[PDB]
């Protein structure tokens, strides 16, 4: 029997494992270390989770390795691997109300949105990649012949081996799903550091793999400190690929950790400060509604959030005036109310960091139209914020706030290259939008945006089949899509003479 933290809430009776997941069992940490996970809706302790120690990493990696080298996962057909990864999705469906609720407590996600996006996309991801298994192909190549003999060259795509996946707190299960699916589909096995503050969905997922008959020790999950658990993963000489999603500063440290250990492969999806340019000739009402989502989605905690909205001179004051009308209607409150539009922030820390961010923007001149402060009420809620009169040199114009904060800069009518320019003025390069009814501006601003993803007359429409990565300092590699896979496969050329 797996040990649960049992909690009756939201018409369910949650059974949450709270332990380490190493080789198929749920165990205590070395020395039975533990920490609390905080419910950000009221700031209470949810329960206590195992605190993975360095020994524990080594143990996890050793399980995964064995499980890849001699374990069932390594021997089965590509096709049958898919079968399991579909089952895995399937189980995840059958538990979705649960998973979403957990996520609702643990990360403060709105339970309706947790359902559709956090859990939904998750379920979707596994299904997608599941499909890619008997479809990962190599080539035969027309190598010059070494006459009077013949030659055949072929490639094989092989797994890379033991992987470490290290992820942040904004969409706990979702992130975990994105990479792990790609990882497991490519035939690898894995140790997962979920963000320390958000362990619960990750662990429940652990259990689910069991129910899916994921072979013992292909998946391993270790709640715990990045500085320690995550650090070992990168240093460990038996792991051979890191998948990372996190802050720029750590990503830099990670890549470094990888080079100094054993030149492991590494993928980075770091920050964004993505510009959304809204033209006067767009659909002004859809632009307020799309562009609010481009900031407020998942309480702002989001990689592709629009860091800046650039708005044609002619439509600006009316766009703002409209956004404030809409913002006043946004329902703040507990994630478990079907009611709620806007939930609480992920953990205290980040609310305090959001508080200062906004102090600071006001300090340096920008106009604070609304919000910019904690919502006074228990738990850690933050008022949707709108800044205007934001200028290119400002902190708030350069820095990734990662919270419900609209940053609006006007762009003078009928230059394009001149705003394009200001939008590519960052070292971030992850996402970007353009709203216009004009085909030419769209197609053009779409080449010129120095960013991995360009939304056109929409926002936040990632999909599990379209590749997702960064340029410049947003990192490299892709998540989701056929091209998320090359991160987790390797290519062997085989040359015969005959």
């Amino acid at each position: 029997v797996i040990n649960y933290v049992e909690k009756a809430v939201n018409k369910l009776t949650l059974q949450m494992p709270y332990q380490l997941f190493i080789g198929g069992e749920f165990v205590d940490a070395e020395g039975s270390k533990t920490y609390n996970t905080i419910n950000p809706t009221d700031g209470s302790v949810i329960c206590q989770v195992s605190l993975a120690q360095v020994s524990d990493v080594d143990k996890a990696v050793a399980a995964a390795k064995e499980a890849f080298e001699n374990g069932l996962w390594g021997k089965i057909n590509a096709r049958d691997r898919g079968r399991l990864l579909y089952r895995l999705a399937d189980v995840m469906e059958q538990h979705q109300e649960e998973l979403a609720t957990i996520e609702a407590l643990d990360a403060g996600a709105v339970y309706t949105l947790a359902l559709k996006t956090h859990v939904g996309m998750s379920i979707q991801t596994f299904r997608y990649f599941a499909g890619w298994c008997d479809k990962i192909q190599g080539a035969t190549i027309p190598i010059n012949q070494a006459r009077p003999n013949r030659n055949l060259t072929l490639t094989k795509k092989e797994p890379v081996g033991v992987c470490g996946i290290v992820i942040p707190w904004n969409y706990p299960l979702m992130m975990l799903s994105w990479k792990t699916a790609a990882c497991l589909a490519a035939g690898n096995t894995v140790v997962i550091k979920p963000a320390q503050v958000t362990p619960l969905t990750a662990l429940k997922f652990a259990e689910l793999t069991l129910k899916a008959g994921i072979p013992k020790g292909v998946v391993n999950i270790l709640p715990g400190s990045g500085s320690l658990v995550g650090q070992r993963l990168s240093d460990h000489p038996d792991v051979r690929k890191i998948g990372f999603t996190g802050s720029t500063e750590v990503g830099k440290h990670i890549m470094k950790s990888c080079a100094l250990s054993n030149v492991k492969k590494v993928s980075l999806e770091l920050g964004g400060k993505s510009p959304l340019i809204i033209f006067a000739d767009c659909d002004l009402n859809k632009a307020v509604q799309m562009g609010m989502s481009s900031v407020f989605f998942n309480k702002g905690e989001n990689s592709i959030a629009a860091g800046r909205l650039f708005v044609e001179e002619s439509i600006h004051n009316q766009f703002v005036q409209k956004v404030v009308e809409e913002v006043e209607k946004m329902k703040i409150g507990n994630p478990l109310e079907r009611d709620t539009n806007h939930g609480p922030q992920n953990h205290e820390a980040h609310l305090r960091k959001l508080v200062e961010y906004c102090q600071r923007g006001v300090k340096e001149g920008a106009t604070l139209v609304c919000g910019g402060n904690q919502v006074p009420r228990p738990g850690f809620f933050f008022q949707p914020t709108v800044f205007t009169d934001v200028e290119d040199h400002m902190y708030i114009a350069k820095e990734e706030s990662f919270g419900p904060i609209m940053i609006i800069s006007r762009f003078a009518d009928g230059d394009v290259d001149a705003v394009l320019s200001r939008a590519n003025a960052t070292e971030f390069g992850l996402a970007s939008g353009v709203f216009t009814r004009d085909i030419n501006k769209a197609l053009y601003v779409s080449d010129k945006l120095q960013a991995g993803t360009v939304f056109i007359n929409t926002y936040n429409k990632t999909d599990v089949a379209a590749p997702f990565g960064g340029f410049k300092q947003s990192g490299f590699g892709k998540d989701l899509g056929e091209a998320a896979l090359n991160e987790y496969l390797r290519i062997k050329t085989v040359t015969f003479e005959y």
Copy 2:
């Protein structure tokens, strides 16, 4: 006018440029520093070559930037870009006796060989990758439509931009070509740091790009030090991809450097203690001749050289008795004589380490069948070496010689799983091979060998179209082949709603 360094040799008149090639003109380095390049056939100073400084990297990098961002290379058609790259091929072809010589002279490549391989394969690289120019395609993906609307998702394959290429000395021009061609074909501008000790053929190529009509600033060559020029490239906040081929130790360092500045893309292609398994049932004549080749080609100064030979017991003795016979037939001598077929080592530095290598080899009680000394003549000649009785734990079964030192071990008659286990016991995995007539043995071995290439009844069968790379700590990323372009490309995802 260009400053040449004329030299009458091999029935030709070399005119060898010898300065930094920045901004598409040849220039002196900061404050006119220079250094000597040495002929490894008589230890003489060939001529003086410019010593690029930090101030010079900075210009070269910012000359490549301008050349991408505002220059003609940034705007011509993709089909037209590749047209320029083919031109370059035939310019290089028309300079093939001249180029095979500068190589013979500068890196001690046997002349017939430089012509065929150093320079000939360099030519085919460019023809090959100019072909890919307008065949680099993106995709359109069947994204989930956001009813009641529609979406369109596509990927554009864009250039990365300003690239650093840092190469070694063993095939000065070919390693330059393999990497440059891909990069330039994907549409990038480059700064190239050749191996300090082999700046000649790179500089000539520098001239030849002017001849082709490559726009000024696309191609930039800085002869100099790895610890100064090399390092600045990887630190530069404006370089975005570092392609690298060299030592494991240096490799590890580059990645860390890349990590630390601006998360720049990196592809390492490092050492290789590559195993060749020879079963009782191959053509034993071919086995020898081919296995010889797998060690002695280009004075064994070759990333993929068979680092070990494992010869099945039943034929071990007779294979060694055959290899020796063949080694004696080898004519050692000056790269430019027609009758020569084993030239000198690249430079003093290295010939010294090779000496030390076999020393240690004998110290550890592996038995020396022949060679292992510096041939007594002037220059840097190393004698074709054979070891036998090399046990797995020994130094000379672990580190990389990169000199013509055939290193032979026994495996027991009708083992397979064990020889393999032995052959894979290295932290390298770049190349490997197996001679055998048993389709089953053949295909299984090539499954199981933990290495980027597996030759099968052949060796040193690289082809511009077959991807060349490393697993484990031999690195990551591919050179040559379609898959190479991946390292010089980025994917932008465009998601339209409508």
Copy 3:
């Protein structure tokens, strides 16, 4: 509510629908016409099946048309489409025993093999292609720009639309699944003529598509005669693609009809006289077992069946002596019994054909070493046959038997080139194989063989991810693999200028 011919057998209760399936429901044919389907084991009547009429092919085709044009099937995201195709696979699994049981009864397929291949490989198909749904991808081509302007060129893969699938009697459900999967996965809609003589699995599967949620009229099955109902599909001006699998002289007639009606795409999987060449250097025990499989598999009613065994002289007599031994052991009898390995032939008609094929084989002087007669038991049982001293000119050497008749020819010890030649000497080109332990002989033979599959050291190993097609008068196009989708897609090029 549906009408079933209900039958208690094989530890279950068959409930087979016996009607045309048209646009959602099961209806009787024009003025209630019907025919008999004959159980091949005892010769009995299984039941009455509706006999579709020209009037009905029209009913069906236009059902499919609506279903494609404003019907739900062509609106659902590509991904949800795969979901339905996956659910249909789950349902087929759920009903697998029933389905094999009908297949056994209807086509006389040994029930163990039917489970694994007929039903098994069918269930595998619909899953394999279900996965391809949201991974069918277009491209962005980097087209020459029309300076001073800019262009973008993309492709979209799209459905061809209403399709006709016309299939034979040897693997009724399987032939249907192979093609229908592909068809449905590319998002078409479809009318199907199963072979008149075997309509039953076909119609069951229709019921199954209802269980699945496949929407009304996406699939329609019309049991009926080729020369009426099929001739109609191939003439119909609203069908835009035909996938045929059948005889040659009928293949030709279809293409001819497709030309004349509306230049509808056609794809043909026709005859075979597939050569299998057996060298003395193989595992000769594994070669009788693999080589009787090549002919006998599913009673020799099997397009890639080895129509012709060339056996190297030195092992010829011992190969025959051994087959003969293994042929005695084969248990002939009721498909539904556990111990039976050789089933009855599909229908009375085809049986007489084989009796005569073998008469005619003796007449020209081939040496009936065993078999050639019908088995003295009720129903339609045919003696596994073996012929030797069979010459390149003989009828049985040239013509396609489609039955359990191994046709053995000697070739000369040493020859490779001269046998290869007599095995390519055919206007057929569907399969071929080679047994040999020698990697050289093996790759070289598979180059030189003129056929769309070459089996090396194995045979009859088809699989859903690997494409299956003919060369020469065996036809063209692919069944299975990613490449069968190309026949069920079209390509629109979109070039913008902007």
Copy 4:
């Protein structure tokens, strides 16, 4: 030495061969027959060209057959076959003035434009496919392993063998090139029937292969009658692929011929009544210039020409008004004079149909805005014609003009679905186009147009890398693009077990 018909024009000495090209040499017809090819600028007999007879096809085929099976074409590297075609591209470029001249003489193509397009794109086409030669890769596929053993599945792409090409008269050289290039590049050898009326550029190319070193037999050109030389190709037992571009009527016929012959692979590029929908919010002035070229380009002898111009109401009057002012500015006249916009039609018989077309036009109720008559000057010039008030039942809405005949219909304001549906109301579907400034329209429409190409805000913007092909009765299969290779390759699946 080759006989020419030498002629001095355009400050040039054309040497034009006029004989059958068969087996790498220029030879006479059987019993030396010939016929006259007729300059359309004035009507003069340009010269007597050879008239290929049936035994002349048997020879051409059998040449290409030897040339493929034993010839150098299929023993050389894929990389070298490539070289040979790049070289041929340069021989074309060196001869481009002459070739563009011959074209303007033989098929009356404005020389200004013959150079840039007829010849320029031919030259680009050979350089395109040349670079595809060594990049036609196969696959390795994750086959289900037959445990306890193992399996390996690869695909080789091989050439199809001897092909026939049959072309129309409108871009004699460019068509020959679109096809011949991709065919030869796929590794095939060919027999090409130029349109009877235009042998001249095809024969010079025939000679040009000789200069370029194309192995004797690889390219065979035979001018003659469609129903004699044409037919015998499509009938011949040794031809395996027929690539054809022409009338739908002939197309149906050729398909049927391939059917009765030997199920030779075919690929039709038939007619087209290509619709162009021009919204009211487009750039008006540009839409004119574009829209006019949509029809008038290359005297309208271009199969993707807009055969229908739906012009939104609010602007239809102003548009016709503008289109007229610009027609007046076009200069009719000798193709050879630099100042000429609109040259003659290809031959008498076509001009006669053109006159009858607009005869039937005015007759039915069309408003003839301008033109519709043969220009009064010698030769075959046809006045650029505009009609309006063209209703949907009119014969000029349904048939293919293939001349300079703009055919304009009104549509209601803001009324997309309706005009769409009008535009799709054809059995053709070769091209379409939309001029609009609004992205949602532009994209929507390009979904819904039932055609193989959709130009958006441009037209006649084909490109050697973008695939070109028709839907419905405009045929199937693509020319140009990677796409195009699929027509000239076969896929061999090779499945090992080991």
